[PDB]
Design a protein around this motif. Structure first.
Motif, short mmCIF file in Angstrom:
data_model
loop_
_atom_site.label_atom_id
_atom_site.label_comp_id
_atom_site.label_asym_id
_atom_site.label_seq_id
_atom_site.Cartn_x
_atom_site.Cartn_y
_atom_site.Cartn_z
N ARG A 155 38.29 50.79 36.63
CA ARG A 155 38.22 49.49 36.45
C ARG A 155 38.57 48.58 37.36
N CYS A 156 38.21 47.49 37.19
CA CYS A 156 38.42 46.35 38.08
C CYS A 156 39.95 46.20 38.37
N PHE A 157 40.38 46.21 39.72
CA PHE A 157 41.82 46.07 40.04
C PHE A 157 42.42 44.96 39.18
N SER A 158 41.82 43.70 39.34
CA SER A 158 42.67 42.35 38.92
C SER A 158 42.58 42.31 37.62
N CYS A 159 41.57 42.13 37.00
CA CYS A 159 41.47 41.79 35.37
C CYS A 159 41.37 43.01 34.61
N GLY A 160 40.80 44.25 35.10
CA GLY A 160 40.83 45.40 34.21
C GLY A 160 39.60 45.59 33.46
N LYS A 211 30.75 38.52 35.54
CA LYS A 211 30.63 37.33 36.04
C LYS A 211 31.88 36.86 36.99
N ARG A 212 32.98 37.29 36.67
CA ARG A 212 33.97 37.12 37.58
C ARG A 212 33.90 37.80 38.91
N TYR A 213 34.42 36.91 40.02
CA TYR A 213 34.16 37.90 41.48
C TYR A 213 35.09 38.76 41.67
N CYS A 214 36.10 39.16 40.74
CA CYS A 214 36.93 40.14 40.90
C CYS A 214 36.09 41.60 40.69
N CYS A 215 35.28 41.46 39.46
CA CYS A 215 34.47 42.67 39.17
C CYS A 215 33.20 42.68 40.16
N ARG A 216 32.79 41.63 40.61
CA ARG A 216 31.69 41.64 41.61
C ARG A 216 32.31 42.20 42.90
ZN LIG Z 1 37.39 41.91 37.37
#
Ligand SMILES: [Zn+2]
Ligand SMILES: [Zn+2]
Ligand SMILES: [Zn+2]
Lengths: 115, 69, 262, 45, 49
Positions: free
Chosen positions: B6-11, B42-47
């Protein structure tokens, strides 16, 4: 090592209750209610709904420490109006609004075809 | 080491988008940004979760197993 | 009568809607509940039988705990803390088993599609790992060289994001209000011109721009919140919103119950 | 008796107290003890 | 976060941010204190130790 268990954030401990009410001596007809295992999610909502009331002279809340999940809510109403009654009315209004919102969202979602 | 689940920030779950990302980079010769946008990041956290990952597990797999069955 | 909702976009994993005629506190509380207070299923305990891979046992346990599981009927499951069993039973948990062997000369990828439910679900709709990609393989859990083996069992209990983020079903939640800054809740940082340097939000098309000559409206409050809820996959996004509202209502009802009983 | 694995052959051997620590398949003098049979519990958090 | 403190996202930590493995190794030998005074790796017993 010293980190507390995460379930302490929402589970009531042994020998403690969700609410405790203490009269306030600073101002007449004022109470302080300590909510346990709660946070801003409930505190802000309750405070705003109390401020919506016309007979509530004062309404505020504070989380004294982020470490512990509890908050204190001070309520002062006009003469002849029980602050507990103000809390009851605020909670009832919140429940009614949330029920109406849930009904409206369900009806709106039922109108979709691309879901 | 291996792609995070999972993406750390948003999940957002990104652990299933690693092989697709590599396939897009290799087979289709897409640049990194377009490949990331194609997978739905789309969000740069996942990117940054997918873009900056280093797949060290391949190196670990090169060594012979200690307990081989 | 009450809060009014109009939804712009509906998808399998996203819902973008407008929440009008509602206080800011209510909208923020709904957002927080959706983030944190929605129960969900996730693997909680891992018994490792065999691990000859290159990854540590707790590394794989953490990865497994982050695997999203189906939680449509999570309300029919009970918390393990208030169940009469000893450690885990069928009324409060779902048991999965991951058994993989590297019998191929090339690397074998252990995905989440190889997770097999062992405990009898009793007809519920819980336990199945969520598959989203077109290939059909779930989350890449591990990799195996030839001759490497990984045998383990998982117990999944219901939980909420407050205890651990692995139980959060809500991903990122977009939340905006007053795109034109008519309430003056922000003071825009700028160098030459604030309007030119700050890109207009996509929601600005849904409100009338200010006339630039009218006086500041000091009586105006905040409403008409543009909210976009994303779903990890455990429960449908509409169910995410509905269960968030339900959980907030349950919290307030519990406050009323405690007040009356004391 | 107690089980060990050759660090190079990756083969399984059983060693007693009086046994010299070597791999009978190749002669390697480095051995790693076998994984325990008792179950191990991990919190997925 | 004053005076060089920082606020870290707990949810991010829960998902694996900055998590680490730590290995520590202990070495132990048996030494020949004499011709037949060799040490022995064994499970000590409270009866004769
Ligand atoms: Zn994310
Ligand atoms: Zn049980
Ligand atoms: Zn050997």
């Amino acid at each position: 090592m010293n980190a507390p268990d995460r379930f302490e954030l929402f589970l009531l401990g042994e020998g403690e209750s969700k609410l405790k009410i203490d009269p306030d001596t600073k101002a007449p007809n004022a109470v302080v209610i300590t909510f346990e295992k709660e946070d801003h999610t409930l505190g802000n909502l309750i405070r705003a709904e109390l401020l919506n009331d016309r007979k509530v002279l004062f309404a505020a809340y504070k989380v004294e420490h982020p470490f512990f999940a509890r908050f204190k809510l001070r309520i002062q109403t006009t003469e002849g109006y029980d602050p507990k009654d103000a809390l009851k009315n605020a909670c009832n209004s919140i429940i009614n609004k949330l029920g109406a919102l849930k009904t409206n969202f369900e009806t709106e979602w039922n109108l979709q075809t691309l879901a | 080491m291996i792609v995070p689940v999972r993406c750390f920030s948003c999940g957002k779950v990104v652990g299933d988008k690693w092989e697709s990302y590599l396939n897009l980079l290799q087979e289709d010769e897409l640049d990194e940004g377009t490949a990331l946008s194609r997978l739905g990041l789309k969000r740069y956290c996942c990117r940054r979760m997918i873009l900056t990952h280093v797949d060290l597990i391949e190196k670990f797999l090169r060594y012979n197993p200690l307990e081989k069955r | 009568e009450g809060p009014q909702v109009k939804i712009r976009e509906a998808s399998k994993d996203n819902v973008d809607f407008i929440l009008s005629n509602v206080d800011l506190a209510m909208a923020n509380s709904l957002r927080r509940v959706m983030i944190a207070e929605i129960p969900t299923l996730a693997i909680d305990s891992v018994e490792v039988e065999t691990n000859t891979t290159v990854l540590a046992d707790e590394f794989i346990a953490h990865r497994l705990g982050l695997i999203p599981l189906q939680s449509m009927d999570i309300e029919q499951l009970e918390y393990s803390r208030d169940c009469f069993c000893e450690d885990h039973c069928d009324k409060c948990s779902v048991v999965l088993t991951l058994q993989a062997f590297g019998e191929s000369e090339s690397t074998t990828n252990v995905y989440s599609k190889d997770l097999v439910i062992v405990s009898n679900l009793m007809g519920r709709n819980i336990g199945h790992p969520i598959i989203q990609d077109k290939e059909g393989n779930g989350v890449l859990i591990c990799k195996l060289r030839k001759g490497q083996e990984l045998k383990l069992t998982c117990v999944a209990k219901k939980g909420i994001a407050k205890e651990h983020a692995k139980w959060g079903p809500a991903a990122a939640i977009e939340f905006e209000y007053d795109p034109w800054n008519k309430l003056k809740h922000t003071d825009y940082w700028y160098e030459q011109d604030s309007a030119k340097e700050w890109p207009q939000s996509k929601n600005c098309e849904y409100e009338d721009p200010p006339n630039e000559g009218d006086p500041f409206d000091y009586k105006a409050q905040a409403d008409t919140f543009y909210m976009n809820v994303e779903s990890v996959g455990s429960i449908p996004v509409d169910q995410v919103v509905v269960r968030g509202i339900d959980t907030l209502q349950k919290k307030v009802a519990s406050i009323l119950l405690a007040l009356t009983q004391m | 008796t107690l089980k060990y694995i050759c660090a190079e052959c990756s083969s399984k051997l059983s060693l007693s107290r009086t046994d010299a620590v070597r791999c009978k398949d190749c002669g390697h003098r480095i051995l790693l003890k076998a994984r325990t049979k008792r179950l191990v519990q991990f919190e997925a958090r | 976060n004053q005076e060089d403190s920082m606020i870290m996202n707990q949810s991010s930590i829960d998902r694996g941010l900055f998590r680490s493995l730590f290995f520590r190794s202990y070495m132990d030998q048996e030494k020949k204190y004499g011709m037949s005074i060799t040490e022995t790796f064994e499970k000590p017993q409270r009866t004769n130790t």
